[PDB]
Amino acid sequence: GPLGSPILELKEKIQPEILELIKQQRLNRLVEGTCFRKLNARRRQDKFWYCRLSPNHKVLHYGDLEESPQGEVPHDSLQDKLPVADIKAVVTGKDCPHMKENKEVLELAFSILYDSNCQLNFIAPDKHEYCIWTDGLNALL
Amino acid sequence: LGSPILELKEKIQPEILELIKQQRLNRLVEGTCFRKLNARRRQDKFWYCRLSPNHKVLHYGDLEESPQGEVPHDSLQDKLPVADIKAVVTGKDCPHMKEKGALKQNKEVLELAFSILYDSNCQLNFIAPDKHEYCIWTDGLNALLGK
Amino acid sequence: LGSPILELKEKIQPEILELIKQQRLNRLVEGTCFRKLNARRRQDKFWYCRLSPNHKVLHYGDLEESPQGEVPHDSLQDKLPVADIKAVVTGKDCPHMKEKGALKQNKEVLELAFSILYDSNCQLNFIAPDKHEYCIWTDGLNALLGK
Amino acid sequence: GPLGSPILELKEKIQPEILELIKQQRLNRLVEGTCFRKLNARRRQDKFWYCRLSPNHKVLHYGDLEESPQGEVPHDSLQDKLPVADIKAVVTGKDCPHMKENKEVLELAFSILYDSNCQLNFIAPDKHEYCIWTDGLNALL
């Protein structure tokens, strides 16, 4: 009473809540993160590099790992960081600066462009990890 | 080619918005019995309005009483093609809420009033029987038009 | 450890059912003004019933008129702890729909009647003002109890 | 009119439709399928083996591939088939008959038990494919 009707709550409440929870889940995939292999390591062992979103969603954290992790990678421990605010664009495939030259690698390549003319270049280990980053970056941006 | 990780954004999310949208519209397909406005002595005092199953036309027609069963789309005299709708207005902005003489409405019914403007001179004027039917129509018409 | 492919079943699906559930319950938190039953000459002719924000207690109390603003939970005389509810009955199975004398209800209101049975002798008896409020209460009580 | 209210459609319509579409999506992941490497091939090349659900959801189809596919694998072309009706159980990890003996492989192992005491044993290529099969089999069963 005496105005308004729960008939409205499908559009006014249920719909935005569902969009929000799907948004949050696209972002939480990034918070969890991905371990990438250091492809040009020429160390005796395999070397790894981790990238993940901070818990408040405002900062990318990334850095070298001595081993592939079997659990959570604390973000503050990683060497490097990138304010999400400082991201200009995400580019994909042939558009990536490290891809100017191979059909399968192009499907896995993405780059984050930031600042002056800086770029954080990736080659995802598989198409699921690739989709996690590109979809999560779309949500973020 | 292309991971199932994408189907939250690309499949589940639009299919959920489509379900919600279709439900808002199907509430008008069911339709509503309205009190007839400017009804003379001895004329039918009700009329029914419902959206066609394909969501393309509003069917409507007078009724002698509030119906106990379903009123099929085809049995209603009149059609208003949805494409012909200019706008929906509510409350004080409805022509039937601007009557000055014997046709004036009680102000008590202001929160219940809406009109569909079509064809740059015409209205379908409504007074909802209640606030829930009001919301069915205004929310349903939002879905049919903008959102 | 453990893929994001699982979060359709394990995260999105339960969070959607929880949203829907919480909405059905929050419709009772808003509550409804009911017509007072067996009201004597000069007694308050309305009463309000609403669920506590934590969904644990039904608050209710008499009102002199149908309220224009919100009726806060705390201002209502009486509490019925949800845990104390045995059952919900409807229509012909409501005690107030079995009255034989001066307290009998018009049969027209049968589809609007429901009662909450509590404490193995007591009822809160309701006649919903309309079919939409009826559904708010019956659907809301289903969510509070079974589903 | 004159009975019922759209207030009911959250519980009676929206809720089951959403469960159904999520069900359908867990099953469609299987319809698309997964290419598995033939780990004990000792052919000159890599050999592959595909497994997928039929479009009507009633039959598993699987068989050897000469190459990793870059597209849709028609199900009728695959050598073998398994009525879903004939599936007794899905077992996981240490419970798998091919796992009686290695923490990372156990996380990827699953077996479909069918018929007499038959078993179709798998080692998923990655944790995403593993989850696609186990979640999809749960939906199916």
Coordinates of C-alpha atoms in Angstrom, one line a residue:
Chain A
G1 CA 0.0 0.0 0.0
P2 CA -1.2 2.5 -1.0
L3 CA 0.8 2.7 -4.3
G4 CA 3.1 0.5 -6.3
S5 CA 2.7 -3.3 -6.9
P6 CA 5.0 -6.3 -6.6
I7 CA 4.1 -6.9 -10.3
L8 CA 6.9 -4.3 -11.0
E9 CA 9.6 -6.3 -9.2
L10 CA 10.4 -8.6 -12.2
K11 CA 11.7 -5.6 -14.2
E12 CA 12.7 -3.3 -11.3
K13 CA 14.3 -5.8 -8.9
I14 CA 14.8 -9.3 -10.2
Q15 CA 16.2 -8.1 -13.6
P16 CA 19.0 -5.8 -12.2
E17 CA 19.9 -8.2 -9.4
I18 CA 20.5 -11.0 -11.9
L19 CA 22.6 -8.7 -14.2
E20 CA 24.6 -7.6 -11.1
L21 CA 25.3 -11.1 -10.0
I22 CA 26.4 -12.2 -13.5
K23 CA 28.7 -9.1 -13.6
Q24 CA 30.1 -10.0 -10.3
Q25 CA 30.8 -13.5 -11.4
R26 CA 32.6 -12.4 -14.6
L27 CA 34.8 -10.2 -12.4
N28 CA 35.4 -12.8 -9.7
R29 CA 36.9 -15.2 -12.3
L30 CA 39.7 -12.6 -12.7
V31 CA 40.0 -12.2 -8.9
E32 CA 40.9 -15.8 -8.8
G33 CA 43.3 -15.4 -11.8
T34 CA 45.3 -17.5 -14.2
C35 CA 48.8 -19.0 -14.1
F36 CA 50.6 -18.4 -17.4
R37 CA 53.8 -20.2 -18.5
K38 CA 56.9 -18.1 -19.2
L39 CA 57.4 -19.2 -22.8
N40 CA 60.8 -17.7 -23.2
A41 CA 62.2 -18.7 -20.0
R42 CA 65.5 -20.6 -20.6
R43 CA 66.0 -21.5 -17.0
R44 CA 66.5 -25.1 -16.1
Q45 CA 62.9 -25.3 -14.7
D46 CA 59.6 -24.1 -16.0
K47 CA 58.8 -20.6 -14.9
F48 CA 55.4 -19.2 -14.5
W49 CA 53.7 -15.8 -14.3
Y50 CA 50.4 -15.0 -12.5
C51 CA 47.8 -12.4 -13.3
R52 CA 44.8 -11.6 -11.1
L53 CA 42.3 -8.8 -10.2
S54 CA 42.4 -7.3 -6.7
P55 CA 39.4 -8.2 -4.3
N56 CA 38.0 -4.6 -4.7
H57 CA 38.3 -4.9 -8.5
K58 CA 40.4 -1.8 -8.9
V59 CA 44.0 -3.1 -9.6
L60 CA 45.5 -5.9 -11.7
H61 CA 48.4 -7.7 -10.0
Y62 CA 50.9 -9.9 -11.8
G63 CA 54.4 -11.3 -11.5
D64 CA 56.7 -14.3 -11.8
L65 CA 56.1 -17.5 -9.9
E66 CA 58.8 -20.2 -9.3
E67 CA 56.2 -22.9 -9.6
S68 CA 52.6 -23.5 -10.8
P69 CA 50.3 -22.8 -7.8
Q70 CA 48.0 -25.4 -6.4
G71 CA 46.0 -22.8 -4.5
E72 CA 45.3 -19.1 -4.0
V73 CA 48.0 -16.6 -5.1
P74 CA 47.9 -13.7 -2.7
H75 CA 47.8 -10.6 -5.0
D76 CA 50.0 -8.2 -2.8
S77 CA 52.9 -10.7 -3.0
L78 CA 53.1 -10.4 -6.9
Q79 CA 55.8 -8.1 -8.2
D80 CA 53.7 -5.8 -10.4
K81 CA 50.5 -3.8 -10.6
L82 CA 48.2 -1.9 -13.0
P83 CA 45.3 0.4 -11.9
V84 CA 42.3 -0.7 -13.9
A85 CA 41.7 3.1 -14.3
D86 CA 44.9 3.3 -16.3
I87 CA 43.7 0.7 -19.0
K88 CA 43.0 2.3 -22.4
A89 CA 41.9 -0.9 -24.4
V90 CA 42.0 -4.6 -24.7
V91 CA 43.0 -5.9 -28.2
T92 CA 42.8 -9.4 -29.5
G93 CA 44.5 -11.7 -32.2
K94 CA 46.1 -10.0 -35.2
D95 CA 45.5 -6.6 -33.6
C96 CA 48.0 -7.5 -30.8
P97 CA 51.4 -5.9 -31.0
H98 CA 53.2 -9.2 -30.3
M99 CA 51.2 -10.8 -33.1
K100 CA 52.5 -8.8 -36.1
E101 CA 54.0 -11.5 -38.4
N102 CA 49.7 -19.2 -36.9
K103 CA 45.9 -19.6 -36.6
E104 CA 45.9 -21.3 -33.1
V105 CA 48.1 -18.7 -31.3
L106 CA 46.1 -15.8 -32.7
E107 CA 43.0 -17.3 -31.1
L108 CA 44.8 -17.1 -27.7
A109 CA 46.5 -13.7 -27.9
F110 CA 45.3 -10.6 -26.1
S111 CA 47.0 -7.4 -25.0
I112 CA 46.1 -4.8 -22.4
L113 CA 47.1 -1.3 -23.6
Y114 CA 47.8 1.2 -20.9
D115 CA 49.4 4.6 -20.2
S116 CA 51.6 6.1 -22.9
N117 CA 52.0 3.4 -25.5
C118 CA 52.6 0.5 -23.1
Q119 CA 51.3 -3.0 -23.5
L120 CA 50.9 -6.1 -21.4
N121 CA 50.8 -8.9 -23.9
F122 CA 49.4 -12.4 -23.2
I123 CA 49.1 -15.8 -24.8
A124 CA 46.5 -17.8 -22.9
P125 CA 47.3 -21.4 -22.1
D126 CA 43.9 -22.5 -23.5
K127 CA 40.7 -21.1 -24.9
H128 CA 38.9 -21.3 -21.5
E129 CA 41.5 -19.0 -19.9
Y130 CA 41.5 -16.7 -22.9
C131 CA 37.7 -16.4 -22.5
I132 CA 38.1 -15.7 -18.8
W133 CA 40.4 -12.8 -19.5
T134 CA 38.6 -11.3 -22.5
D135 CA 35.1 -11.6 -21.0
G136 CA 36.3 -10.4 -17.6
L137 CA 38.1 -7.4 -19.1
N138 CA 34.9 -6.5 -21.0
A139 CA 33.0 -6.6 -17.7
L140 CA 35.7 -4.5 -16.1
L141 CA 35.9 -1.9 -18.8
Chain B
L1 CA 35.8 -23.0 -31.5
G2 CA 35.0 -20.9 -28.4
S3 CA 34.7 -21.7 -24.6
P4 CA 31.6 -22.4 -22.5
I5 CA 32.9 -19.7 -20.1
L6 CA 31.2 -17.2 -22.5
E7 CA 27.7 -18.5 -22.1
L8 CA 27.0 -16.6 -18.9
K9 CA 27.3 -13.3 -20.8
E10 CA 26.4 -14.5 -24.2
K11 CA 23.7 -17.1 -23.7
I12 CA 22.3 -17.2 -20.1
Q13 CA 22.1 -13.4 -19.6
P14 CA 20.1 -12.6 -22.8
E15 CA 17.9 -15.6 -22.4
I16 CA 17.0 -14.5 -18.9
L17 CA 16.2 -10.9 -20.1
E18 CA 14.1 -12.4 -22.9
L19 CA 12.2 -14.6 -20.5
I20 CA 11.4 -11.5 -18.3
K21 CA 10.5 -9.5 -21.3
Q22 CA 8.2 -12.2 -22.7
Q23 CA 6.5 -12.5 -19.2
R24 CA 5.8 -8.7 -19.1
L25 CA 4.2 -8.9 -22.5
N26 CA 2.3 -12.1 -21.8
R27 CA 0.5 -10.4 -18.8
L28 CA -1.2 -8.2 -21.6
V29 CA -1.9 -11.3 -23.7
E30 CA -4.0 -12.4 -20.8
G31 CA -5.6 -8.9 -20.6
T32 CA -7.9 -7.1 -18.2
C33 CA -11.6 -6.2 -17.9
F34 CA -12.0 -2.4 -17.7
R35 CA -15.0 -0.3 -16.6
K36 CA -16.5 1.4 -19.7
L37 CA -16.0 5.2 -19.7
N38 CA -18.8 7.6 -20.8
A39 CA -21.3 4.7 -20.8
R40 CA -24.8 5.7 -21.4
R41 CA -27.8 4.3 -19.7
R42 CA -28.4 0.8 -21.0
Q43 CA -25.0 0.5 -22.9
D44 CA -22.4 -2.2 -21.9
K45 CA -20.6 -1.1 -18.8
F46 CA -17.4 -3.2 -19.3
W47 CA -14.8 -3.7 -22.0
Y48 CA -11.9 -6.0 -22.3
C49 CA -8.4 -5.4 -23.7
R50 CA -5.8 -8.0 -24.5
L51 CA -2.6 -8.3 -26.6
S52 CA -2.5 -10.8 -29.5
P53 CA -0.5 -13.9 -28.9
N54 CA 2.2 -12.6 -31.3
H55 CA 2.3 -9.3 -29.5
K56 CA 1.4 -7.3 -32.6
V57 CA -2.1 -6.0 -32.0
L58 CA -4.2 -4.9 -29.0
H59 CA -7.7 -6.3 -29.3
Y60 CA -10.5 -4.7 -27.4
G61 CA -14.3 -4.7 -27.2
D62 CA -17.3 -4.0 -25.0
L63 CA -18.7 -6.6 -22.7
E64 CA -22.1 -6.8 -20.9
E65 CA -20.5 -8.2 -17.7
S66 CA -17.1 -9.0 -16.2
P67 CA -16.3 -12.3 -17.9
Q68 CA -15.8 -15.6 -15.9
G69 CA -14.0 -17.4 -18.7
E70 CA -11.4 -16.3 -21.2
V71 CA -12.4 -13.8 -23.9
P72 CA -10.8 -15.0 -27.1
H73 CA -8.8 -12.4 -29.1
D74 CA -11.0 -13.0 -32.2
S75 CA -14.2 -12.2 -30.4
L76 CA -13.2 -8.6 -29.7
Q77 CA -14.6 -6.0 -32.1
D78 CA -11.6 -3.7 -32.4
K79 CA -7.9 -3.8 -33.1
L80 CA -5.2 -1.3 -32.3
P81 CA -1.9 -2.3 -34.1
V82 CA 1.0 -1.8 -31.6
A83 CA 3.1 -0.1 -34.4
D84 CA 0.5 2.7 -34.5
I85 CA 1.1 3.7 -30.8
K86 CA 2.7 7.1 -30.4
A87 CA 2.9 7.3 -26.6
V88 CA 1.5 6.3 -23.2
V89 CA 0.5 9.0 -20.8
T90 CA -0.6 8.7 -17.1
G91 CA -2.5 10.5 -14.3
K92 CA -3.1 14.2 -14.9
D93 CA -1.8 14.0 -18.4
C94 CA -4.7 11.8 -19.6
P95 CA -7.4 13.5 -21.6
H96 CA -10.2 11.8 -19.6
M97 CA -8.6 13.2 -16.4
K98 CA -8.9 16.7 -18.0
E99 CA -12.8 16.6 -18.3
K100 CA -14.4 19.8 -17.0
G101 CA -18.1 18.9 -17.1
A102 CA -20.4 16.0 -16.5
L103 CA -17.7 13.5 -17.7
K104 CA -15.2 14.4 -15.0
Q105 CA -13.6 11.6 -13.0
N106 CA -13.2 11.5 -9.2
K107 CA -9.7 12.6 -8.3
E108 CA -9.5 9.4 -6.3
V109 CA -8.9 7.5 -9.6
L110 CA -6.0 9.7 -10.8
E111 CA -3.3 7.1 -9.8
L112 CA -5.2 4.5 -11.8
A113 CA -5.5 6.4 -15.1
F114 CA -3.5 5.9 -18.3
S115 CA -4.0 6.4 -22.0
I116 CA -2.4 5.2 -25.1
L117 CA -2.1 7.9 -27.8
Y118 CA -2.2 6.6 -31.4
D119 CA -2.7 8.2 -34.8
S120 CA -1.9 11.8 -33.8
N121 CA -5.6 12.6 -32.6
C122 CA -6.8 9.4 -30.9
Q123 CA -6.7 7.8 -27.4
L124 CA -7.6 4.6 -25.8
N125 CA -8.4 5.9 -22.3
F126 CA -8.3 3.5 -19.3
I127 CA -9.0 3.6 -15.6
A128 CA -7.4 0.5 -14.1
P129 CA -9.6 -1.4 -11.7
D130 CA -6.7 -1.4 -9.2
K131 CA -3.0 -0.6 -8.7
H132 CA -1.9 -4.1 -9.7
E133 CA -3.7 -3.9 -13.1
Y134 CA -2.3 -0.4 -13.5
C135 CA 1.2 -1.8 -13.1
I136 CA 0.4 -4.7 -15.5
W137 CA -0.5 -2.2 -18.2
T138 CA 2.1 0.4 -17.6
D139 CA 4.9 -2.1 -17.2
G140 CA 3.6 -4.2 -20.1
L141 CA 3.4 -1.1 -22.4
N142 CA 6.9 -0.1 -21.4
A143 CA 8.1 -3.6 -22.6
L144 CA 6.1 -3.3 -25.9
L145 CA 7.6 0.1 -26.6
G146 CA 10.8 1.5 -24.9
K147 CA 11.1 -0.6 -21.6
Chain C
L1 CA 41.6 -25.5 -7.8
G2 CA 38.2 -25.9 -9.7
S3 CA 36.9 -24.4 -13.0
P4 CA 34.5 -21.5 -13.6
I5 CA 32.4 -23.8 -15.8
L6 CA 30.9 -25.0 -12.4
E7 CA 29.5 -21.6 -11.4
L8 CA 26.3 -21.9 -13.5
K9 CA 25.2 -24.9 -11.4
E10 CA 27.0 -24.1 -8.2
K11 CA 26.8 -20.3 -7.9
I12 CA 24.5 -18.6 -10.4
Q13 CA 21.6 -21.1 -10.0
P14 CA 21.4 -21.0 -6.2
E15 CA 21.9 -17.3 -6.1
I16 CA 19.0 -16.8 -8.5
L17 CA 16.7 -19.1 -6.4
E18 CA 17.8 -17.2 -3.3
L19 CA 16.9 -13.8 -5.0
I20 CA 13.4 -15.1 -6.0
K21 CA 12.9 -16.6 -2.5
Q22 CA 13.9 -13.4 -0.8
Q23 CA 11.6 -11.3 -3.1
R24 CA 8.6 -13.6 -2.2
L25 CA 9.3 -13.0 1.4
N26 CA 10.0 -9.3 1.1
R27 CA 6.5 -8.8 -0.3
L28 CA 5.2 -9.8 3.2
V29 CA 7.8 -7.5 4.9
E30 CA 6.0 -4.7 3.0
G31 CA 2.7 -6.2 4.3
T32 CA -1.0 -5.5 3.6
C33 CA -3.9 -3.6 5.2
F34 CA -6.8 -6.0 5.9
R35 CA -10.5 -5.4 6.7
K36 CA -11.1 -6.2 10.4
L37 CA -13.3 -9.3 10.9
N38 CA -16.1 -9.4 13.6
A39 CA -15.6 -5.7 14.2
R40 CA -18.1 -4.2 16.5
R41 CA -19.7 -0.8 16.1
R42 CA -17.1 1.8 16.8
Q43 CA -14.1 -0.6 16.8
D44 CA -11.2 -0.1 14.3
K45 CA -12.3 -1.6 11.0
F46 CA -8.7 -2.3 9.6
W47 CA -5.6 -4.2 10.7
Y48 CA -2.2 -4.4 9.2
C49 CA 0.0 -7.5 8.9
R50 CA 3.7 -7.4 8.0
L51 CA 6.7 -9.8 8.2
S52 CA 9.7 -8.6 10.3
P53 CA 12.8 -7.5 8.2
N54 CA 14.6 -10.7 9.4
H55 CA 11.6 -12.9 8.4
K56 CA 11.2 -14.3 11.9
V57 CA 7.9 -12.7 13.1
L58 CA 4.6 -11.6 11.7
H59 CA 3.7 -8.3 13.3
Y60 CA 0.0 -7.2 13.2
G61 CA -2.3 -4.7 14.8
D62 CA -5.6 -2.8 14.3
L63 CA -5.7 0.5 12.5
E64 CA -8.4 3.2 12.4
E65 CA -8.0 3.7 8.7
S66 CA -6.1 2.3 5.7
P67 CA -2.7 3.9 6.1
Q68 CA -1.1 6.3 3.6
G69 CA 2.5 5.9 4.9
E70 CA 4.4 2.9 6.0
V71 CA 3.3 1.2 9.3
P72 CA 6.6 0.4 11.2
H73 CA 6.9 -3.2 12.5
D74 CA 7.4 -1.9 16.1
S75 CA 4.2 0.1 16.1
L76 CA 2.1 -3.1 15.7
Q77 CA 0.6 -4.5 18.9
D78 CA 1.0 -8.2 18.3
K79 CA 3.6 -10.7 17.2
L80 CA 3.2 -14.2 15.7
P81 CA 6.6 -16.0 15.6
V82 CA 6.8 -17.8 12.2
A83 CA 8.2 -20.9 14.0
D84 CA 4.9 -21.3 15.8
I85 CA 2.9 -21.7 12.5
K86 CA 1.4 -25.2 12.0
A87 CA -0.3 -24.7 8.7
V88 CA -2.1 -22.4 6.2
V89 CA -5.6 -23.2 5.0
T90 CA -7.7 -21.5 2.3
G91 CA -11.3 -21.0 1.0
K92 CA -13.9 -23.5 2.5
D93 CA -11.3 -24.9 5.0
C94 CA -11.0 -21.6 6.9
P95 CA -12.9 -21.4 10.2
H96 CA -14.2 -17.9 9.4
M97 CA -15.7 -19.4 6.2
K98 CA -17.5 -22.0 8.3
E99 CA -19.6 -19.5 10.4
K100 CA -23.3 -20.4 10.6
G101 CA -24.9 -17.4 12.2
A102 CA -24.5 -13.6 12.1
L103 CA -20.8 -13.8 11.5
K104 CA -21.1 -15.6 8.2
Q105 CA -19.1 -14.3 5.2
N106 CA -20.6 -13.7 1.7
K107 CA -19.7 -16.7 -0.5
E108 CA -18.3 -14.1 -2.9
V109 CA -15.2 -13.8 -0.7
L110 CA -14.4 -17.5 -0.6
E111 CA -11.6 -17.3 -3.2
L112 CA -10.0 -14.5 -1.0
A113 CA -10.0 -16.3 2.4
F114 CA -7.0 -17.9 4.1
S115 CA -6.0 -18.6 7.7
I116 CA -2.8 -19.3 9.4
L117 CA -3.1 -22.0 12.1
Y118 CA -0.8 -21.7 15.0
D119 CA -0.5 -23.2 18.6
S120 CA -2.9 -26.1 18.0
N121 CA -6.1 -24.0 18.8
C122 CA -5.6 -20.5 17.2
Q123 CA -6.1 -18.8 13.9
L124 CA -5.2 -15.6 12.3
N125 CA -8.1 -15.4 9.8
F126 CA -7.8 -13.1 6.7
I127 CA -10.0 -12.1 3.8
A128 CA -7.6 -10.6 1.2
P129 CA -8.8 -7.3 -0.2
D130 CA -8.2 -8.7 -3.7
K131 CA -6.7 -11.7 -5.7
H132 CA -3.3 -10.1 -6.0
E133 CA -3.0 -9.6 -2.2
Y134 CA -4.3 -13.1 -1.8
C135 CA -1.4 -14.4 -4.0
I136 CA 1.1 -12.2 -2.2
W137 CA 0.1 -13.9 1.1
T138 CA -0.3 -17.5 0.0
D139 CA 2.9 -17.4 -2.2
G140 CA 4.8 -15.6 0.6
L141 CA 3.6 -18.1 3.3
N142 CA 4.6 -21.0 1.0
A143 CA 8.1 -19.5 0.8
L144 CA 8.3 -19.0 4.6
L145 CA 7.2 -22.6 5.2
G146 CA 7.4 -25.4 2.5
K147 CA 7.5 -23.5 -0.8
Chain D
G1 CA -9.3 -12.4 -14.5
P2 CA -11.2 -13.7 -12.6
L3 CA -8.7 -15.8 -10.6
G4 CA -4.9 -16.0 -10.3
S5 CA -2.4 -13.2 -10.3
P6 CA 0.8 -12.5 -12.2
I7 CA 2.4 -12.1 -8.7
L8 CA 2.6 -16.0 -8.9
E9 CA 4.7 -16.0 -12.1
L10 CA 8.1 -15.5 -10.3
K11 CA 7.8 -18.8 -8.6
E12 CA 5.5 -20.6 -11.1
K13 CA 7.0 -19.4 -14.4
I14 CA 10.3 -17.5 -14.1
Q15 CA 11.9 -19.9 -11.6
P16 CA 11.3 -23.2 -13.6
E17 CA 12.2 -21.5 -16.9
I18 CA 15.5 -20.3 -15.6
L19 CA 16.3 -23.8 -14.1
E20 CA 15.4 -25.4 -17.5
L21 CA 17.6 -23.1 -19.4
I22 CA 20.6 -23.7 -17.1
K23 CA 19.9 -27.5 -17.4
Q24 CA 19.8 -27.2 -21.2
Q25 CA 23.1 -25.3 -21.2
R26 CA 24.9 -27.9 -19.0
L27 CA 23.8 -30.5 -21.5
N28 CA 24.6 -28.5 -24.6
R29 CA 28.3 -28.3 -23.5
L30 CA 28.3 -32.1 -23.9
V31 CA 26.6 -31.9 -27.3
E32 CA 29.5 -29.8 -28.4
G33 CA 32.0 -32.2 -26.9
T34 CA 35.6 -32.6 -26.1
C35 CA 38.7 -33.8 -28.0
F36 CA 40.9 -36.0 -25.9
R37 CA 44.5 -37.0 -26.7
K38 CA 45.2 -40.8 -27.2
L39 CA 47.9 -40.9 -24.5
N40 CA 49.1 -44.4 -25.3
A41 CA 49.1 -44.0 -29.0
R42 CA 52.6 -44.9 -30.3
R43 CA 51.8 -43.9 -33.8
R44 CA 54.1 -41.5 -35.6
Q45 CA 51.5 -38.7 -35.1
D46 CA 49.3 -37.5 -32.3
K47 CA 46.0 -39.4 -32.3
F48 CA 42.9 -38.0 -30.8
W49 CA 39.5 -39.4 -29.5
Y50 CA 36.3 -37.4 -29.4
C51 CA 33.3 -37.7 -27.1
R52 CA 30.0 -35.9 -27.4
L53 CA 26.3 -36.1 -26.6
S54 CA 23.7 -36.6 -29.4
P55 CA 21.5 -33.5 -30.3
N56 CA 18.4 -35.3 -28.6
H57 CA 20.5 -35.9 -25.5
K58 CA 19.9 -39.7 -25.5
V59 CA 23.2 -41.2 -26.8
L60 CA 26.9 -40.7 -26.1
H61 CA 29.0 -40.9 -29.3
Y62 CA 32.8 -41.4 -29.3
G63 CA 35.7 -42.5 -31.4
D64 CA 39.2 -42.0 -32.8
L65 CA 40.1 -38.9 -34.8
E66 CA 43.2 -38.6 -37.0
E67 CA 43.6 -35.0 -36.1
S68 CA 42.4 -32.4 -33.5
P69 CA 39.2 -30.8 -34.9
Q70 CA 39.0 -27.1 -35.6
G71 CA 35.2 -27.3 -35.8
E72 CA 32.1 -29.4 -35.2
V73 CA 32.5 -33.2 -35.1
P74 CA 29.4 -34.9 -36.6
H75 CA 28.3 -37.5 -33.9
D76 CA 27.0 -40.2 -36.4
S77 CA 30.5 -40.4 -38.0
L78 CA 32.2 -41.5 -34.6
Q79 CA 33.0 -45.2 -34.3
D80 CA 31.1 -45.9 -31.0
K81 CA 28.0 -45.2 -29.0
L82 CA 26.5 -45.5 -25.6
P83 CA 22.8 -45.1 -24.7
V84 CA 22.6 -42.6 -21.8
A85 CA 19.9 -45.1 -20.4
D86 CA 22.6 -47.7 -20.1
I87 CA 24.7 -45.5 -17.7
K88 CA 24.9 -46.9 -14.1
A89 CA 27.2 -44.3 -12.5
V90 CA 29.9 -41.6 -13.0
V91 CA 32.9 -42.0 -10.7
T92 CA 35.7 -39.6 -10.1
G93 CA 39.4 -39.6 -9.0
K94 CA 40.7 -42.5 -6.8
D95 CA 37.4 -44.2 -7.3
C96 CA 38.1 -44.7 -11.0
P97 CA 39.2 -48.2 -12.0
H98 CA 42.1 -46.8 -14.1
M99 CA 43.3 -44.9 -11.1
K100 CA 44.1 -47.8 -8.7
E101 CA 47.8 -47.3 -7.9
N102 CA 49.7 -38.5 -8.7
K103 CA 47.6 -35.7 -7.3
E104 CA 47.1 -33.8 -10.6
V105 CA 45.9 -36.8 -12.7
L106 CA 43.4 -37.8 -10.1
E107 CA 41.9 -34.4 -10.3
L108 CA 41.2 -35.0 -14.1
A109 CA 40.1 -38.7 -14.0
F110 CA 36.5 -39.8 -14.4
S111 CA 34.9 -43.0 -15.6
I112 CA 31.4 -43.8 -16.9
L113 CA 30.2 -47.3 -15.6
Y114 CA 27.7 -49.0 -17.8
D115 CA 26.1 -52.4 -18.6
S116 CA 27.7 -55.5 -16.9
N117 CA 30.9 -54.3 -15.4
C118 CA 32.0 -52.1 -18.3
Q119 CA 33.8 -48.7 -18.0
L120 CA 34.6 -45.9 -20.2
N121 CA 37.6 -44.2 -18.6
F122 CA 38.8 -40.7 -19.2
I123 CA 41.6 -38.3 -18.2
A124 CA 40.5 -34.8 -19.1
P125 CA 43.0 -32.5 -20.9
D126 CA 42.4 -29.7 -18.3
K127 CA 40.1 -28.9 -15.3
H128 CA 37.7 -27.0 -17.6
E129 CA 37.0 -30.0 -19.7
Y130 CA 36.8 -32.2 -16.6
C131 CA 34.2 -29.9 -15.2
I132 CA 32.3 -29.9 -18.4
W133 CA 32.0 -33.7 -18.3
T134 CA 31.3 -34.2 -14.6
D135 CA 28.8 -31.3 -14.4
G136 CA 27.2 -32.4 -17.7
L137 CA 26.9 -36.0 -16.6
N138 CA 25.3 -34.8 -13.3
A139 CA 22.7 -32.9 -15.4
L140 CA 22.2 -35.9 -17.6
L141 CA 21.8 -38.4 -14.8

